[PDB]
């Protein structure tokens, strides 16, 4: 009767399991981040960059402890176990949601700032020696925390206490909930998804990628100890960014679900699903708070994974059949990619190396992997002129009508570069004889363009063959 509607109906097993995960993440997170904060505080580094990096890691540790010590216990009591009434008053309702929002901005901005300091260390060392200072980095970290508090102000006005009992008078129906319309709530949830998640993680990913490549080039073409440390920092920060994106995506999907699904679609089934989804997505938020100190400890492991992946790329290109076998057996990432977006399979198909292609596919290589322009291994094989690789690829389930950013299909590339044999085999496997690129060019048009009169003929024949169908 009085507060029946506010009942959540998650089974007791769920609550106990989630409580176990929450308490496990509480101790792992508090010990990990506590030890980090303590150590870094008592630490004095000769090298400016080491000091500056540690200031950022100290910020990340502080934000994590605030969520684990203050947010987690409140969440466990009032959102996992006792859904109504809210125990902690109006200020507690606003303070809880303010703290959580502000901590996401602080984490995101600390990660982006870290990725900028590393980028400059690697790509502008001489300017970085002068333009950077310990005391200026401290001032900037203060500005980050103030900016994070300012961006979280909307939660003070969007969240509050409401009595959702039948007639709004029963004390059991007193809940911490949004106190603004859906239109207003949509705006604030989108602000957080963009400015704490999508935008900052996209910028940290770009800076981290460019820094990693530039380090490889500046090494390939110095201080051994600096390169070793920078390579660890880049790879740790990459694991931090990936960990952040995986852990926060469900949370942002859940909040968008809350404002985008219409009343009519809110069945009890969907209501029931939501409160289970809440358990999973809030668990992953506490994983986010606990994982960074563990990632710092796996720095040498991350360098090894990276060394293996990069060795498989050279093995697959250079034509070292044996090297590829060994590296795969170890556990080297078969679907790793270089600066262009080429996987080992891309590099194998490009250079010939029928064997290495067969070995890679067998281990479970993505046959339809796209480089940054949308070229599949089948594109590369058609372009260079290797029939056996095309047959092997098609066999393993390669898309015959896969198109790049310009709308170039494999049949376009076979016809353009005078590969009659390949034109034949692609047609046989269901290649559209009149596929057009952005500019209306068919395989036939490209055959004639490059004075390939024999291949224009077979394509004419392929075209008239379609016409007889009707």
């Amino acid at each position: 009767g009085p507060n029946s509607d506010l009942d959540v109906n998650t089974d007791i097993y769920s609550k106990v399991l989630v409580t176990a995960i929450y308490l496990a993440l509480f101790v792992v997170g508090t010990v990990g981040n506590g030890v980090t904060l303590f150590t870094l505080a008592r630490k004095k580094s000769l090298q400016s960059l080491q000091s500056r990096v540690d200031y950022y890691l100290g910020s990340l540790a502080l934000s994590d402890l605030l969520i684990l010590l203050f947010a987690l216990p409140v969440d466990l009591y009032n959102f996992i176990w006792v859904h109504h009434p809210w125990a902690f008053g109006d200020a507690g309702c606003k303070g809880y949601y303010f703290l959580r929002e502000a901590c996401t901005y602080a984490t995101a901005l600390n990660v982006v700032s870290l990725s900028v300091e590393l980028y400059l260390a690697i790509c502008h060392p001489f300017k970085a020696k002068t333009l950077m200072s310990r005391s200026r980095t401290k001032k900037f970290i203060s500005a980050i925390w103030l900016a994070s508090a300012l961006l979280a102000i909307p939660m003070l006005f969007t969240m509050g206490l409401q009595n959702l009992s039948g007639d709004g008078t029963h004390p059991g129906g007193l809940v911490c909930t949004p106190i603004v319309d859906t239109a207003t709530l949509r705006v604030v949830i989108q602000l957080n998804t963009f400015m704490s998640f999508l935008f900052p993680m996209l910028v940290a990913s770009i800076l981290n990628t460019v820094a990693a490549r530039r380090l490889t080039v500046m090494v390939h073409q110095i201080e051994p100890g600096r390169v070793q440390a920078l390579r660890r920092g880049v790879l740790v920060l990459r694991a931090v960014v990936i960990a952040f994106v995986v852990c926060w995506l469900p949370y942002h999907v859940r909040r968008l679900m809350f404002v985008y699904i219409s009343d009519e679609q809110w069945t009890t089934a969907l209501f029931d699903f939501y409160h289970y989804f809440y358990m999973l997505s809030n668990a992953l938020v506490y994983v986010s708070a606990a994982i960074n100190p563990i990632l710092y400890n796996l720095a040498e492991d991350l360098v090894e994974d990276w060394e293996k992946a990069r060795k498989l790329l050279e093995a697959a290109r250079k034509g070292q059949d044996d090297e590829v076998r060994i590296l795969l057996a170890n556990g080297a990432d078969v679907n790793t990619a270089d600066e262009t977006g080429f996987t080992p399979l891309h590099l194998a198909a490009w250079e010939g190396h029928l064997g290495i292609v067969e070995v890679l596919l067998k281990n479970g290589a993505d046959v339809n992997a796209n480089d940054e322009r949308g070229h599949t291994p089948l594109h590369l094989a058609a372009y260079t002129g290797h029939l056996e690789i095309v047959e092997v690829l098609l066999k393993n389930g390669a898309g015959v009508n896969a198109t790049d950013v310009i709308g170039t299909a494999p049949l376009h590339l076979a016809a353009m570069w005078g590969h009659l044999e390949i034109v034949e085999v692609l047609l046989k496997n269901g290649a559209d004889v009149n596929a057009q690129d952005k500019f209306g060019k068919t395989p036939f048009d490209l055959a004639i363009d490059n004075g390939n009169e024999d291949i224009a003929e077979v394509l004419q024949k392929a075209a008239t063959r379609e016409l007889e169908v009707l």
Binding site: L6, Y97, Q162, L185, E264, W266, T267, T268, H275
Partner: peptide, 8 residues
């Protein structure tokens, strides 16, 4: 339906 969640 119509039973929206109250917990964000």
């Amino acid at each position: 339906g119509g039973r929206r969640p109250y917990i964000l």
